[PDB]
């Protein structure tokens, strides 16, 4: 009968976890005491003796084949795989060297110390016991208050690889000790070790790949994914166990890593459910095994008490701590030299990071029960129980004190300021809306004291060289926060990628940490491109290149390099847009001329270098650029569409059912975006004919233009037309970036594909008024003046296309004037562009040469012509924007030009 024991264990674990969670000490100790308490009555009363003797006397096989695989698979499941594989090499090498040296040193000191009549096998398996560790508690504290990510991942990898090597070493030595009937020839031993090392992971990789391929063809379902995944994990464990009593754990760890790595073939609800399932199983097993070890140690170790071991436990603890410290200190400088070193803080927090856990105690139980009636088992269990109960509390409190005294988990002034500002805005909004609500009729009888008590929130965070140094430091912090606020902004609109975001912000902090320093480019230079071992191996293999695999290998190689290329182009675009924003916003923050001009100069210099390198890599491969541009466009369209549908739901136009259905349709489209192939096809120069906005809807005119245009090419830094020269014709820019300067104070700007050149000269039969110079090798289509007359003829009875053309020629001239206006002060190009789009162009014929000016219109600008005022009678040279005091405007008949104007009504 076992029900009462398991139920009591669950209840005690729940109550302890609830009660004792406030203190930083892990709960696991106190329940251990409960087990000891039970031992006190276990001998005393026959009843509890009956129950605990029924349970505690279990076979070692059940523990060895059940409790360990669950624990290790849990330790391997909940882990950011990407952060792991970004530090895999250093974490694995350091972990395995550290574990082997720790094991051998503690074994030889055990030989030197106890004078126990032991072979080297006992010592080395003892060392394998103390080599293991528990990462759940330390990562729990770090997620509680440490506020660091990389530290948790590296300590997790440390613990995981340590546990794997420890368990294989222990199992093989247990076989070799307690089953002496087996031969130990070298060939079978090395063959066994090699197949343990290799075949397991390959078997796990194969089963993971095939089950992911199976899952890839199932959509909008929930049950089949869970059932298939659980069945696959069990079959993997069963095969890997029947072949080897070790290979199962490594195979299932590899399976867990691979399954976690995949994301797009498994919906998020499935993975959150699986995460919770495995976490619950691990928690239950951990609680049961801790209570079990508590009762067995308090009922066995009472007969082997003396001062000798009670004094030697302390020196054992000091020994393991000092050896771990010296080995990691010895490996610090080589990691620094290789370019993968850490700080003092990381080293010292890793130094006291080793927390012995359930794995070592499980090994203690299995060796104790398998050893039979002997003093060795009692000594083993007492030693490991004492060492774990000591090290848990001591190392927990020293981590707490160390985190306080070194204080890397301190708060920073900038984020405190940001939180204070956010709370200010929230409380202001609350005040405004409650003041609005107070005026309502029905909602006036409410007592507002309890209201303002309940609704209110709280902040959770609560000449000289010296002056020049501190002001440039605070300017450095201000440009840092301007950068990071910008980067968060473009990510939120949907202009950039999440991993690109984290890479770029971590570049931000690492630039921030250095004194009087900002973001460099050598780190970026290595960031966007790759000269490593992967490009060399891939180029040499594709140059030197059973038949069908090779195309698959080369295509997956091209995919794996294009991914890095895309990420690099993305981070370049994000960095450049961030620089231009911070430079354009910081121009009025401070008045110290030298600092502002020097920072603007270095920002401009870096801008030039990054745009130069970006142009170089763009010329290397345009297809990746067009692919990422399309991906960006679809991302942002989907984002804005989902915002619009949420808004439409907000006005109540839809029941929740159809909103839910359309949300799923949008989510399906986004999921298809994730699996969009990174194809790199350059677009032909003929699709753009249909993509012109003001040539849209005219197939006949498009064909005529294709039959009446000349392809023109220009080299780097060439000039097409110059200011004041005769109108050579009309052009459409279709490749490259171009610069333009003219009379507006000479204005200068840069335009790109999607513009017409020489429109004013063709419309007015007038020479050039500005100079256009191409910045690189470009191509355009040129249209002659006779072809322009033919186009005017082919306008026929639809000059609304010509009306849109006149709208564009008004767009050319109005936006600089609207920018130089007080009513649109501080207005972005998007704001003004979305403003005048709703406006309409007007002629003088529909007004019969006389217009009345009302207050309905918001803005009005006339381009050219002969217009007079009816009341003021003042000759004003158009374009000219004045106040709305003028009410009537008179017009005359002119033949040299056609007078028109534009109105925007709000």
Ligand X SMILES: Nc1ncnc2c1ncn2[C@@H]1O[C@@H]2COP(=O)(O)O[C@H]2[C@H]1O
CA atoms within 13 A on the CB side of 702: 14
Q: Taking each helix axis as running N to C, give the angle between helix 3-19 and helix 268-300, from 0 to 180 degrees, rounded to the nearest 10.
A: 110
Q: Is 675 annotated as a binding residue?
A: no
Residue 62 binds ligand POV, judged by CB under 6 A: yes
Beta-carbon count within 10 A of 44 CB: 10
Q: Is the dihedral of CA 141, 145, 146, 147 positive or negative?
A: positive
Instruction: CB nearer to ligand POV: give 237 or 569.
Output: 237
Q: Rounded to 5 degrees, what angle do the CA atoms 7, 10, 13 make?
A: 145
Contact with a second copy (CB under 8 A) among 347, 390, 419, 876: 419
Stretch that binds ligand X, among 516-524, 675-683, 808-816, 891-899 (CB under 6 A): 808-816
Q: Is 760 annotated as a binding residue?
A: yes
Contact with a second copy (CB under 8 A) among 467, 522, 793, 830: 830
Residue 280 binds ligand POV, judged by CB under 6 A: no
The rounded Cα 519 to chain-centroid distance in angstroms is 20
Q: Is 606 annotated as a binding residue?
A: no
Calpha distance 771→740 (Å, rounded): 6
DSSP secondary structure, 229-282, as one string:
HHHHHHHHHHHHHHH-TTHHHHHHHHHHHHHHH--TTS-HHHHHHHHHHHHHHH
Residues 6+ apart with CB under 8 A from 514: none
8 Å CB contact between 165 and 102: no
* Residue 741 β-bridge partners: 748, 771
Q: Which does 59 bind (CB under 5 to 8 A by kind): ligand POV, a second copy, ligand X, none?
A: ligand POV
Interaction residues for ligand X, span 682-741 (CB under 6 A): 727
8 Å CB contact between 614 and 575: no
Nearest distance, CB of residue 820 and ligand X, angstroms: 12
Calpha distance 14→10 (Å, rounded): 6
Interaction residues for ligand AJP, span 267-296 (CB under 6 A): 284
Beta-carbon count within 10 A of 278 CB: 19
Contact with ligand POV (CB under 6 A) among 19, 66, 746, 819: 66
Of 578, 410, 611, nearest to 479 (Cα)?
578
State residue 124 phi and psi, 5-degree precision.
-75, -35
Calpha distance 132→126 (Å, rounded): 11
Residue 831 binds ligand X, judged by CB under 6 A: no
- The DSSP 8-state label assigned to residue 143 in this structure reads I
Residue 224 binds ligand AJP, judged by CB under 6 A: no
Q: Is 758 annotated as a binding residue?
A: yes
Nearest distance, CB of residue 217 and ligand AJP, angstroms: 20
Alpha-helical regions (H) of 494-620: 498-513, 522-528, 533-544, 549-585, 593-620
Residue 745 binds a second copy, judged by CB under 8 A: no
Residue 396 in tokens? 């927990």
Residue 719 binds ligand AJP, judged by CB under 6 A: no
Residue 2 binds ligand AJP, judged by CB under 6 A: yes
8 Å CB contact between 682 and 688: no
Site string for ligand POV, 236-275 (x = CB under 6 A): -x--------------------------------------
Residue 813 binds ligand X, judged by CB under 6 A: yes
Instruction: CB nearer to a second copy: give 132 or 215.
Output: 215
Instruction: CB nearer to ligand AJP: give 153 or 236.
Output: 236
Contact with a second copy (CB under 8 A) among 182, 308, 413, 443: 443
Stretch that binds ligand X, among 251-259, 582-590, 670-678, 753-761 (CB under 6 A): 753-761
8 Å CB contact between 870 and 837: no
Calpha distance 45→51 (Å, rounded): 11
Nearest distance, CB of residue 389 and ligand POV, angstroms: 28
Nearest distance, CB of residue 818 and ligand X, angstroms: 11
Stretch that binds ligand POV, among 48-56, 64-72, 106-114, 321-329 (CB under 6 A): 64-72
The rounded Cα 147 to chain-centroid distance in angstroms is 16
Q: Which does 770 bind (CB under 5 to 8 A by kind): a second copy, ligand AJP, ligand X, none?
A: ligand X
Of 72, 161, 152, 141, nearest to 395 (Cα)?
141
8 Å CB contact between 870 and 851: no
Nearest distance, CB of residue 720 and ligand X, angstroms: 10
Q: Number of H helices and number of E strands within the chain?
A: 33, 14
Q: Is 769 annotated as a binding residue?
A: yes
Residues 6+ apart with CB under 8 A from 607: 576, 579, 580, 583
- The site for ligand X, by CB under 6 A, has a size of 13
Residue 441 binds a second copy, judged by CB under 8 A: yes
Contact with ligand X (CB under 6 A) among 130, 361, 504, 757: 757
Residue 286 in tokens? 């951990």
Interaction residues for a second copy, span 646-665 (CB under 8 A): 648-655, 658, 661-662, 665
Of 132, 129, 137, 133, nearest to 283 (Cα)?
137
Residue 768 binds ligand X, judged by CB under 6 A: yes
Contact with ligand X (CB under 6 A) among 361, 770, 805, 867: 770
Contact with ligand X (CB under 6 A) among 101, 590, 702, 760: 760
Interaction residues for a second copy, span 596-635 (CB under 8 A): 622, 625-626, 629-630, 632-634
Q: What share of the chain is helix, strand, coil (3-state, %, to 5)?
A: 65, 5, 25
Calpha distance 762→47 (Å, rounded): 107
Residue 198 binds ligand POV, judged by CB under 6 A: no
8 Å CB contact between 903 and 853: no
Q: Which does 97 bind (CB under 5 to 8 A by kind): ligand POV, a second copy, ligand X, none?
A: none
Instruction: CB nearer to a second copy: give 65 or 369.
Output: 65
Calpha distance 682→75 (Å, rounded): 47
Stretch that binds ligand POV, among 233-241, 318-326, 494-502, 847-855 (CB under 6 A): 233-241
Q: Which does 475 bind (CB under 5 to 8 A by kind): ligand X, a second copy, ligand POV, none?
A: none
Nearest distance, CB of residue 3 and ligand POV, angstroms: 10
Interaction residues for a second copy, span 465-504 (CB under 8 A): 485-486, 488-489, 491-492
Stretch that binds a second copy, among 81-89, 538-546, 644-652, 862-870 (CB under 8 A): 644-652
Q: What are the binding residues?
A: 758-761, 768-769
Q: What are the binding residues for 3',5'-cyclic AMP?
A: 758, 760-761, 768-769
* Residues at the site binding ligand X, with contacts judged by CB under 6 A: 727, 742, 757-761, 768-770, 812-813, 816
């Amino acid at each position: 009968k076992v029900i009462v024991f398991i139920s009591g264990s669950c209840l005690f674990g729940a109550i302890s976890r609830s009660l004792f969670k406030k203190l930083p000490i892990p709960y696991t100790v106190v329940l251990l005491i409960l087990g000891a308490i039970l031992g006190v009555v276990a001998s005393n009363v026959p009843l509890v003796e009956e129950h605990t003797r029924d349970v505690a006397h279990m076979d070692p096989h059940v523990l060895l084949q059940i409790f360990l695989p669950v624990l290790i698979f849990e330790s391997a499941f909940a882990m950011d795989v990407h952060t792991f594989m970004r530090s895999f090499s250093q974490v694995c090498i350091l972990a395995l060297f550290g574990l082997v040296v720790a094991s051998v040193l503690t074994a030889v000191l055990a030989m030197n110390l106890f004078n126990y009549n032991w072979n080297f096998s006992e010592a080395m398996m003892f060392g394998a016991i103390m080599s293991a560790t528990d990462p759940v508690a330390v990562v729990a504290l770090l997620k509680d208050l440490g506020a660091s990510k990389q530290l948790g991942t590296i300590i997790e990898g440390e613990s995981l690889l340590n546990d794997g090597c420890a368990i294989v070493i222990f199992n093989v030595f247990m076989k070799m000790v307690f089953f002496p009937q087996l031969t130990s020839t070298v060939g079978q031993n090395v063959l066994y070790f090699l197949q343990v090392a290799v075949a397991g992971p390959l078997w796990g990789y194969a089963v993971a790949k095939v089950t992911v391929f199976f899952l890839s063809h199932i959509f909008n379902d929930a049950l089949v994914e869970i059932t298939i995944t659980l069945a696959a994990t069990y079959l993997t464990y069963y095969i890997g166990d029947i072949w080897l009593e070790v290979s199962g754990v490594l195979a299932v760890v590899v399976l867990g890593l691979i399954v976690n790595a995949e994301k797009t073939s498994i919906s998020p609800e499935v993975e959150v459910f699986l995460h919770r399932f495995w976490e619950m199983l691990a928690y239950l097993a951990n609680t049961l095994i801790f209570m079990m070890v508590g009762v067995v140690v308090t009922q066995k170790a009472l007969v082997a008490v003396d001062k000798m071991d009670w004094f030697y436990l302390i020196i054992l603890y000091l020994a393991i701590t000092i050896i771990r410290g010296m080995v990691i200190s010895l490996f610090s400088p080589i990691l620094s030299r290789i370019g993968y070193g850490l700080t003092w803080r990381n080293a010292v927090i890793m130094t006291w990071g080793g927390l012995r856990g359930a794995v070592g105690l499980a090994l203690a139980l299995v060796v104790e029960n398998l050893a039979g009636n002997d003093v060795i088992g009692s000594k083993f269990l007492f030693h490991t129980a004492g060492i774990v109960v000591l090290t848990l509390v001591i190392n927990a409190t020293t981590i707490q004190t160390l985190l306080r005294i070194l204080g890397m988990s301190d708060i920073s002034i900038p984020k405190r300021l940001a939180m204070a500002g956010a709370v200010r805005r929230i409380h202001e909004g609350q005040n405004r809306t409650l003041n609005m609500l107070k005026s309502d009729r029905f909602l006036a009888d409410a007592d507002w004291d309890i209201a303002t008590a309940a609704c209110e929130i709280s902040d959770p965070y609560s000449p000289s060289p010296r002056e020049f140094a501190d002001m440039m430091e605070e300017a450095r912090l201000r440009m840092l926060k301007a950068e990071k606020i910008s980067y968060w902004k473009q990510f939120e609109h949907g202009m950039l990628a999440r991993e690109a975001l984290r890479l770029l912000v971590q570049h931000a902090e690492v630039a921030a940490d250095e004194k009087d320093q900002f973001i460099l480019v050598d780190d970026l230079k290595k960031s966007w491109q790759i000269k490593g071992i992967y490009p060399w191996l891939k180029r040499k293999l594709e140059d030197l290149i059973t038949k069908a695999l090779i195309p698959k290998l080369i295509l997956v190689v091209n995919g794996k390099i294009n991914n890095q290329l895309s990420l690099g182009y993305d981070v370049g675009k994000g960095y450049i847009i961030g620089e231009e924003e911070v430079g354009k916003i910081i121009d009025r923050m401070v008045d110290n001329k030298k600092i502002l001009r020097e920072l603007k100069h270095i920002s401009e210099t870096g801008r030039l270098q990054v745009v130069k390198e970006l142009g170089l890599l763009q010329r290397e491969h345009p297809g990746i650029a067009v692919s990422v541009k399309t991906r960006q466009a679809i991302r942002t369209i989907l984002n804005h569409s989902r915002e619009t549908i949420h808004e439409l739901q907000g006005a109540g136009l839809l029941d929740e059912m159809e909103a839910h259905k359309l949300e799923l349709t949008v989510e399906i489209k986004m999921k298809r975006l994730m699996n969009a192939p990174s194809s790199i096809p350059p677009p032909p120069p003929e699709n753009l004919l249909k993509n012109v906005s003001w040539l849209a809807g005219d197939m006949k005119l498009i064909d005529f233009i294709k039959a009446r245009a000349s392809l023109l090419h220009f080299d780097y830094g060439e000039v097409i037309v110059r200011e004041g020269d005769e109108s050579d014709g009309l052009f459409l820019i279709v490749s490259g970036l171009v610069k333009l300067y003219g009379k507006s104070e000479v204005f200068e700007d840069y335009l790109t594909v999607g513009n017409v050149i020489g429109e004013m000269g063709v419309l007015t039969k007038k020479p050039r008024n500005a100079t256009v110079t191409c910045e690189t090798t470009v191509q355009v289509y040129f249209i002659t003046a006779e072809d322009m007359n033919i186009a005017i003829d082919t306008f026929t009875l639809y000059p609304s296309l010509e009306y849109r053309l006149w709208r564009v020629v008004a767009i050319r001239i109005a936006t600089p004037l609207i920018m130089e206006q007080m009513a649109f002060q501080g207005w972005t190009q998007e704001k003004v562009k979305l403003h005048l789009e709703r406006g309409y162009l007007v002629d003088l014929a529909e007004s019969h040469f006389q217009f009345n000016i009302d207050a309905t219109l918001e803005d009005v600008i006339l381009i050219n012509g002969t217009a007079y005022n009816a009341h003021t009678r003042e000759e004003i040279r158009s374009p000219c924007l004045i106040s709305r005091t003028v009410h009537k405007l008179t017009f005359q008949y002119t033949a040299t030009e056609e007078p028109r104007l534009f109105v925007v009504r709000n």
